[PDB]
Amino acid sequence: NNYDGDTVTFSPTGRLFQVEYALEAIKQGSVTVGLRSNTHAVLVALKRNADELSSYQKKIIKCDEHMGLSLAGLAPDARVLSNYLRQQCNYSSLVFNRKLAVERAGHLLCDKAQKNTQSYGGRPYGVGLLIIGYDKSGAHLLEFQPSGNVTELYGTAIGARSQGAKTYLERTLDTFIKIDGNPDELIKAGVEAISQSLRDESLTVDNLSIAIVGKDTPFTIYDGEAVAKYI
Amino acid sequence: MDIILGIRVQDSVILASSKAVTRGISVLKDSDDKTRQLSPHTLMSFAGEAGDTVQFAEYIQANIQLYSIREDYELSPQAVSSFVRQELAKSIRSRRPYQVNVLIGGYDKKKNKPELYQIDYLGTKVELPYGAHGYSGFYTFSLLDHHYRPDMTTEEGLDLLKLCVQELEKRMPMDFKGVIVKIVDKDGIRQVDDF
Amino acid sequence: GSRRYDSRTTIFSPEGRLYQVEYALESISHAGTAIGIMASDGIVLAAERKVTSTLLEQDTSTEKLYKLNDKIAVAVAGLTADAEILINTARIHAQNYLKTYNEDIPVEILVRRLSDIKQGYTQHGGLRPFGVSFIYAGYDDRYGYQLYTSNPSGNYTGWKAISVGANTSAAQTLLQMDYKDDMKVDDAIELALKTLSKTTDSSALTYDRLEFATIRKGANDGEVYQKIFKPQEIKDILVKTGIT
Amino acid sequence: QFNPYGDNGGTILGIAGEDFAVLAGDTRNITDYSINSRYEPKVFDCGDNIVMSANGFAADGDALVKRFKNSVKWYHFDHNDKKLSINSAARNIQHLLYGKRFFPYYVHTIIAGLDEDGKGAVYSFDPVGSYEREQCRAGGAAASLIMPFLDNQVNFKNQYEPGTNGKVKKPLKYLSVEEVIKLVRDSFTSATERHIQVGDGLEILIVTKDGVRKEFYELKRD
Amino acid sequence: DRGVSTFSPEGRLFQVEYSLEAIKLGSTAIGIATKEGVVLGVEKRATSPLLESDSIEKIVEIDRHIGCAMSGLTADARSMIEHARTAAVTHNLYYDEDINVESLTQSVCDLALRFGELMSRPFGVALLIAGHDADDGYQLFHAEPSGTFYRYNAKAIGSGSEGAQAELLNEWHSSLTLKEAELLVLKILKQVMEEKLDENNAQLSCITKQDGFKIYDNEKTAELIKELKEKEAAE
Amino acid sequence: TTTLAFRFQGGIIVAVDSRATAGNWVASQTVKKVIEINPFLLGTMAGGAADCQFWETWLGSQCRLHELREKERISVAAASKILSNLVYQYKGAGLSMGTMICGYTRKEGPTIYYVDSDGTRLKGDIFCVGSGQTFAYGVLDSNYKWDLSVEDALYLGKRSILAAAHRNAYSGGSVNLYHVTEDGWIYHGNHDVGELFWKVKEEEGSFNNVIG
Amino acid sequence: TQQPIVTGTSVISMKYDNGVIIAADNLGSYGSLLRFNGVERLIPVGDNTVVGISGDISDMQHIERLLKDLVTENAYDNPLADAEEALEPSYIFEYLATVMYQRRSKMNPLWNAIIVAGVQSNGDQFLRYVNLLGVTYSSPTLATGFGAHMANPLLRKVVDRESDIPKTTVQVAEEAIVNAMRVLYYRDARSSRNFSLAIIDKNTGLTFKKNLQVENMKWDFAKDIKGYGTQKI
Amino acid sequence: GYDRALSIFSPDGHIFQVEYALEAVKRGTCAVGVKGKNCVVLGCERRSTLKLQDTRITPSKVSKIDSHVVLSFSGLNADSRILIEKARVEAQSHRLTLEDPVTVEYLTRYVAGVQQRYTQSGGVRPFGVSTLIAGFDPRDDEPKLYQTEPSGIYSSWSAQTIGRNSKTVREFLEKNYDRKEPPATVEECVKLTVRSLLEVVQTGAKNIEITVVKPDSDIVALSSEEINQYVTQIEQEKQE
Ligand SMILES: *[C@@](C)(CO)[C@](*)(O)[C@H](CC(C)C)NC(=O)[C@H](Cc1ccccc1)NC(=O)[C@H](CC(C)C)NC(=O)[C@H](CCc1ccccc1)NC(=O)CN1CCOCC1
């Protein structure tokens, strides 16, 4: 009310309203799902269009050969954060000849988002990210929120009606976690998960967006006729 | 760049500047005009380091032309020469100084008098009846000391100038390919085409 | 952040006016009146000191009339402290010009630069404008005797006779009535004092409440002299015109 | 006074065929009269069917290759995984080199691959970025030994058709991958014989539309 | 007052949303993409009859293979075009090749959100960026001040956009010829324009692989306008 | 290097050799010393290969940005001055460039500008640039007339490079010919000195110093 | 622009079937003065890497601090700091190689020659060299300074190429290293008798041996040598 | 540095600071530009509440940017000086690098670009100025007349007016100016310009300024008597 003019102001109950309004931008964004087993990690994203004449907004971005994310909310903010991740992954490779740990990737994003919530003039990032990767400790899935909070998960979902997919994964947890050495089945579980967040619309060939990374699989994105298999 | 001469007579200033542009063992050009018009009644000749000469001349030209537009008024030769000197005086203590020597021949319309200023790359200004830069002066000064008179006409000044060029063509080691002569008077600046 | 406390000094009103410039002019309208009158053989500067106290040291005082160089002077109306900032800048600018061209600065060039500084404070920087209006009196070999005025907007204009400060409306009407083009300095001196005497908010105009100056070619042969009047000299000129 | 440059020796060689290109280089690394390594590769697969070698001062050579490899990576990120053509790579490398015009990379750079018509391509660079496409180029310590031999055997220079009174030149033709590797091996054994900084091993990278293949051969170790 | 980079309770940037209202006040601009080329057309909208309409430059070249149309506060587009042209030429210098249309659009859209308390406010202009490259062929992009860009088969921006977009929805198909697209822009422009459409108050342009980006002459467009009227009366 | 360009009745002839050296080591015989900036503008290269190659391709980018911004092809004067002002910024840094900006516009007509790395910019009708410039001058000047035909002018430019290619050790390889007209530049082929010398010797009867 | 003041001489090393061996004497020379005798020039990083350093000792101590800080930084927010995400020899080397080249490129080098010896997580032997110029190379045997001239020839007789590595045991490899250190003591005027030796094995781990001495030296033949030519007495 | 975003969007999509800058232009004295067949004429109003003025030294309303281009304006007088100075500097800079004087379009585009920059730069307000820029391109005889405004938009005009009561004089020009046949001579062009100002001005004494620009840097300002002759001629023809 009187405490939402900028990010530098606390409310009387200790809330940061600009951060909460940034969180609100994610809820309006199109649904995207993340889940992993022990061998692979999968991103599934429902892309959104302006109208039938327009293209479908690309949700998934590659950060390195072993890491990438999906976005929900302000796409330009995802571009800034993904670019930062690309540089950090790259710095780790050039300087230390070392693939960046997915956990450090999350710590770096957390700290970058945080600085924007404590200083005057700036604004919080208006996007949520689901980071997947495969590093020296196996497969990983992270959930980034622009408040700064990063959380490692077996599976999750963000965006509009994400609660449906999140409930499904909470039920299916014991099943999909053990899908080891089988990419197509892990994707199927992710495609069935995102289907629980659909209303009136269904998954078409230029609507669905899938990405995967794993043990002997570089981070690769599937769009167009390459996802027709999973419909 | 080598030979630039200046002679102030009764009612005009005459500048003579060599036409040769030499690089190494090759005369690249024999029709080079080593001068810029700073204003309708002010002319500046120049000589020195390659590149610096033209870059400096045009920079001054732009500044004087800017002043003329702003004030709708022509700066006096004295004022222009003081501006030029200050620029060179700044330059000599810069990271890379302009290695350019200039003569400024102008006609002051308020005083109705011709004026010749000699300024070297250090920012050393002097008003003179006749001037020269480089090795030219080692011949022409003594020659002009003898033959020059303050009440001479423009035509007498041109004959006096011919006497300088002839001496330079006789005793100078390098072939400077003749000179372009320009006259500055009450009616402005004009070029002598046959010299 | 700090946005909360920003007055926004350099913005337009809905009517297209600059708030701070208008309010600075309102401030100047309460300042002691200053009059400039340009004659064919010189310029007169006359200014009324702001409600003088009897214990004020009058002879070693300078409130209204300042010297910029040997050929140019100014009469001030508004905040004196603001004026002195601008005066020192103007003095330096005149010396920069002399150093560069070996010639005394033309009056308009000095006025334009000083007015450009004022303009800057109205368009950028977020600072309040200078609450000062000047009357420039000066001479050069191009235009001869010249009178200008500048105000907080940074706009300047040339005049034959002009007033700034308090009661300019009444003062300008009186000047417009009695001024003529073939006027002499001595006549202009009389007009300046008569105008102040009528427009003043004081009971009677006296020597101790005035500053006076002339810029004549009254020196020996083709050269300009600046005369900042002494208290006794103002006392004499006030008697000579029959005001006291 | 500290001297920021050094000479790591070695020599490299690029030959272009009709539908292939090779980039060879010896594996010896030296300083002064000492051998640092008998097997230190300096010919690298940089992705997008581009092979590269920057011979001379190895520290600068490694830095350049490292920066170009990174340039390829970011080219994919910024331009929707578009394949970096050999001509585009060459121009990019010019800017990398010329970027340090006043503190140069002390290397002779050669890249090899296929052009956009599928034909074999070799580009060579001087230390400050001047580049040129050629059928043939040797670089490094023994370049002065190998290059004239390549002019004679690859481009058939000074060779005329027998009995034509030195009037008809020997006609230009593409060489097979088998014939090119013969010339590379003979070039390096000859250079090994007469140049002290060349020897130990020969590593050849062959580029076709199918990918990047490697071949290794022993050289004299004296 | 309030911060420039402030979020509303709904989760949108106030200034970005307000700039979108300014774009709705702008003159109409329509783009249609086909397999034979991309067509760009604009409403000039001269404020007075004394204004020389040919000086109204709302269609602009970025490179030989990329063109651009604008709508909204058109003065704001100048620095966007300048950046686009430099980006296009700079890439050619670095890589000895034409730059992808998408990459060019992305470079322009990176400027968009570089505002706050960088420039003082978002751009008040939307751009239709049309071009061709070897990889993705003929393309049309809509670049907004939000920093977002969508690819479109056909797109209208400006005051008559929602009406024109609904019309483009029905009329567009994947087998449109270049000539058919030209007439379709003129048809839809004439519908949404206030004043009557002619060669002086409307401008056409196109980009083809062969001839590159070309702004049509008033003589060429006048014939297409005449061809359009005859075809509508013919049934 | 040896390069030249001269103005005549039928426009401009531009001729260059193709050799590149590193000391006494002949590094290349097939270098392109003419840069095609646009259909009406050419640039010649002499001195530091990288310096010339890099900055003249950069010049082409600047000339392109001009015609996008101004909707008009850049003048030869303005093009040459972009380059001269650029190298002047680097004066003393050690750039080595001897260039000629040759082209045609409506307002200027056929125009040649000499531009070098120490800041010199000269308009003129005839220039020869490079270590072999003097050898080219000798043949060019002694045979030059304004009223040369396009055929004779092309040959004289070719013959002048050949002369320098022969006498100067740091020039050779092949001759590249260009002809600039009101309609733009026209390429007139690559001519290898290996065959050209003997062809010229036999047909012309010149080069009697050489063992035939 | 520097000049080295207090210096350390040769660092020598080689690969063997299960790991690597590295050695360096304990001397800190001050020109011709053999100033400091308790200087440790082998610095372990974790339980899988040993960095041997020669050249300027002040710069060596700076590098020690960097490596020490690298271990600290790696532990931050890293639950697997003593397991999968522990510092590898390849990470440590690339870091140093980056620093060495950056410093030479700023015309202010770390005046050192460095050999990073260790064993990777997958069991592979790691041995690589880097110096003040940022020059890097790897070989079955590596040595710095006089070691390059005298030790390498001896160590290469044991492991002359890659295929000789599996055939070389830790006993044979250590014997050659210890022999090389003796030869360096005979012939290098800035060497000492006291030295340290480190073995990094993929099975037995890191074994750090301090206070070793050169022994079994041949000096007896010196008594027979009289004069410089003719002299009989 | 002062960073505040003064020019910003409002809910309805307007930038009030730019629109309020237009109100300042609307307050300013009237300025008119009319281009004939071989010339351009710039007419300017001068308000007559200021007597005892010195017209020798008072800044003229029309300013020369170069020998071939002129600039008049309406709005804040102090603001105009900054644009004029920048334009004059750019004119000399263009001659220095391109070796050719600016085109009228280029000079306009520059001035318009400066005005635009001040509408989305932090810490500054827009210029309260609209300009009429007129002249002839080098080696060209086609007349050029351009207008700029605070927002930064610019465009070419056959004839145009700006300032106070400009809508009245624009109404006049819209019916009196023929595109097919512009003023064939200098006299015709000046007369139409004076006529248009007489719809608004008051008296045709020392209130109207006229500046005529012709090809090849031929610019001249008319005196009082010269202008008064047009005023006397128009009034006599009016009484009919
Ligand atoms: C005639 C041939 C006279 O030179 C022409 O002027 C040609 C002009 C054409 C090529 C544009 N000029 C040259 O061939 C030019 C001559 C030259 C050499 C050095 C400085 C100035 C002028 N040659 C070069 O520039 C060569 C071209 C290479 C061989 C393709 N380049 C070099 O010599 C380079 C780079 C020189 C350099 C300049 C500035 C900073 C750093 C370096 N140097 C080497 O290649 C060094 N060297 C070669 C032999 O192996 C050891 C390393």
Ligand SMILES: [Mg+2]
């Ligand atoms: Mg050998």
